[PDB]
Amino acid sequence: MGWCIFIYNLGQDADEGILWQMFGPFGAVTNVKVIRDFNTNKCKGFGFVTMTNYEEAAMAIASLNGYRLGDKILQVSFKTN
Amino acid sequence: MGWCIFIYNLGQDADEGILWQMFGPFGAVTNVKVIRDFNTNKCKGFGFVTMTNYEEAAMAIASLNGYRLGDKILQVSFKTN
RNA sequence: UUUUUU
């Protein structure tokens, strides 16, 4: 199943490409998702990345939590619920 | 096969019976479906109901959109796409 | 601020 990473504070413009670019360097990434409103196709402000190996995921989170992405401070953590 | 109604914000637990119960009072209902993950039958958070009369579907939509079902506010509309 | 149209 890998490990699901939740990213908060993406801009309404954000694309999957940016999630790939940020997490890719840390190890295997199997899925990225920007969450959009169905009717406007705008980003609702969050997204998800699945990484296969926990230690890689944890390194991504340690580096990216608090990143200034565009003009927002990201919150990055393992997905809850 | 009739007017397709989209219901968002069902619980993981949701069953067909809750859709029948809520939509039944409004008129003829021919089909209900809770959308579940294929390999784990957890509800994906949404479902569909098919009603045969336009005015009865409209009534159900206008009355149930915003309903507090369990601890979630439903979004109920005519299916889009 | 935790995956919204089979």
Residue numbers in the entry:
A (entry chain B), B (entry chain A): 242 to 322
Article sentences:
We initially selected two 6-mer RNA substrates: a sequence comprising the AUUUA pentamer derived from an ARE in TNF-α 3′UTR, (AU6tnf – UAUUUA), and a poly-U RNA that can be found in class III ARE elements without AUUUA repeats (U6 – UUUUUU). It thus seems plausible that the lower Kd of RRM3 binding to U6 results from both avidity due to binding in multiple registers and preference for U-rich over AUUUA motifs. We observed a substantial increase in RRM solubility after RNA binding and were thus able to use untagged RRM3 incubated with selected RNA ligands for structural studies of the complex. On the 3′ end of the RNA, nucleotides in positions 5 and 6 are closer to the RRM3 β2β3 loop in case of the U6 ligand than when AU15 or AU6tnf are bound. Interestingly, the β2β3 loop that is in close proximity to the 3′ end of the RNA in the crystal structure of the RRM3–U6 RNA complex appears to be most significantly affected by U6 titration. To summarize, the core of the RNA interactions with RRM3 is formed by three binding pockets with canonical aromatic residues from RNP2 and RNP1 (Phe247, Tyr249, Phe289) that recognize a U–U–U/A RNA sequence motif. The affected area correlates best with the dimeric interface found between chains A and B in the structures of RNA-bound RRM3 suggesting this is the dimerization interface in solution.
Hu/ELAV proteins share a common protein architecture with two consecutive RRMs, separated from the third RRM (RRM3) by a less conserved, flexible hinge region of variable length. Here, we report crystal structures of HuR RRM3 free and bound to U- and AU-rich RNAs.
